[PDB]
Symmetry: C2
Subunit: 95 residues, 2 copies
């Protein structure tokens, strides 16, 4: 059934999103593009672990990066994931 395969793809995205450290990154990018320094400042996660979570989210296409001189800026990339995350942001992270 078509409807069934769409649920599995929705299921697989929610499995990718339902990790505490990575979602915390995603939630911070939902209010907009951030530098690596600034996720590091905001997250109490260890910085080697922030860099590994960022590499994981980038490789999965959930975030993307750009360079501006020395500065690496990250933003949400996957548009369907970004839509889910923004609704999650509005429901949990908005007071």
């Amino acid at each position: 059934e078509e409807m069934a395969t769409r649920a599995r793809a929705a299921s697989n995205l929610l499995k990718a999103l339902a990790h505490e450290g990575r979602l915390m990154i995603m939630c911070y990018l939902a209010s907009g593009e951030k530098s690596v320094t600034e996720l590091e400042t905001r997250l109490s996660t260890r910085q080697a672990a922030v860099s590994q979570q960022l590499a994981r989210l980038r490789l999965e296409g959930l975030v993307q990066s750009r360079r501006e001189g020395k500065t690496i800026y990250y933003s949400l990339s996957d548009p369907r994931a970004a839509r889910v995350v923004q609704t999650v942001y509005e429901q949990f992270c908005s007071g």
Copy 2:
């Protein structure tokens, strides 16, 4: 502050962990287009009726679905309005046309 943000994102993580199960989400996706009977749920799903009722029981105890009776027909729908909003966006992004 940053500590509150982390607590809120960890709570949001907990909802997504609850939604990220294939059979249960299949139910939630079906309820996202509106109220469904148990009969038409069990029609539409490849899941066994013992397992569908186990999935409905889990979703009910999590607060994510509610049910009402009409005669012998039981109608399930979304309950938690926070989780309903997330599910509707998931429904729009993946399950819609």
